[PDB]
Symmetry: C4
Subunit: 32 residues, 4 copies
């Protein structure tokens, strides 16, 4: 169970590569 | 404490559906 | 310690109200 | 497992400094 919690944290820390998206959104804004 | 931690992790992985706003922001930028 | 972990999850789930910011960023884009 | 979980939570609360991109996105939008 403690392992499963660790796994879910690793998936969130996966999910937060959001910060890919934000870099791309920033680039689009510089151009437009 | 373990059950409450598991509950919070699932709610965070809820909160990250952020991916609503970001999808809309990306669409708006494609169109501009 | 398990309590401290729960506390940090609650702070992150604080931090993610990011999704305030994203709603505001979306609104600015609709206007510009 | 407890130490590794604590390590991941601090790294996530690192990853959320996202608040780089979002600050820049907000500034760009104010100027447009």
């Amino acid at each position: 169970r403690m392992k499963q919690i660790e796994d879910k944290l690793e998936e969130i820390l996966x999910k937060l590569x959001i910060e890919x998206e934000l870099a791309r959104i920033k680039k689009l804004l510089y151009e437009r």
